[PDB]
Amino acid sequence: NPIVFYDIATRPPVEKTCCSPNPWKTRLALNFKDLPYSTSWVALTLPIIEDPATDSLVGDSFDIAVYLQKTYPKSGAGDLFPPQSLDYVFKHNGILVPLSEFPEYARFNMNIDAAFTTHTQLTVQGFPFDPATAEATKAEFVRRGGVSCWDDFEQREKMMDSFQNMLGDLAKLFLKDTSGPFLLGTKASYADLMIGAWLRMMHVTLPESEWEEVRSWHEGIFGQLYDALETYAEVK
C-alpha cells in the first residue's frame, strides 16, 4: 500500500546525515502531500519511487513531483505547482554546455540546480560518506571537480563570497511577496522545495559557522525559508 522511496545512503545515522539534493526534493514533496511512504537507502538515477496504488515506478525528482501532483492533486498542503512567474536565470549557465508539463517550474529547477552545484566544492570537507561507498564517491568528486587527488580539495573565503553573491540574486525573488517566507508569501510551492533541498545539503555539510552565514545573509531569507520548510522535513 505505501509508497517506497529510494534515497542515497550516507554515513550513520542516515536520518541526520542524508544530504542528496534531488532525493531531498522528493522527500519534501512527499511530506508536503502528507503521503504514507517508507525509505529504502541505496548505496551509490536516484530518487525513485514505487507507488503500489497505481503500480507505477517513477524516477527523476521533477517527474516524481509531477506524478504526485497529477495523482494526488488535493492531498496534504495541496497544489505543488501553483501558477507563478519564476523569473530567475542562472546567468553562469552559458550556451554551449548541452542540456515539459510545468515549463516555468521545469526551467526554475534547472537554474536552481545550476546555481547551487557550482558552489558544491564548499561541501567536500563535510560530506557524510557511506563508509562502503567512500573511496568510490571520493573518486567521483575528484573526477568531477577537475582536481588530481582527494587532498587537492583564504581561497575558501573567496568561495563563500561567490556563494553569497548567487544567493543575493536569488533572494530578490523572495522580495516580491514578503507576507510569508515562500516565493508566494504564505503559500509554499515545489519551487520552494527545490531551494529547500539544496539548503538541507548545505546545512549537513558546511561548517556550522558557514551555515550560520548562509542562514543570515540577505536579511536571513534563506534561514527563514529553511525554518519554514522544517514542517515538511520529516525523514520517514
From TrEMBL:
GO-annotated molecular function: transferase activity
A Pfam family it matches: GST_N_2
Tagged with keyword Cell membrane: no
Keyword list, A-Z: Transferase
Glutathione S-transferase UstS-like C-terminal domain span: 152-232
Residue ranges annotated for the GST N-terminal domain, each copy included: 20-70
Record carries keyword ATP-binding: no
Name of the protein described by the UniProt record: Glutathione S-transferase
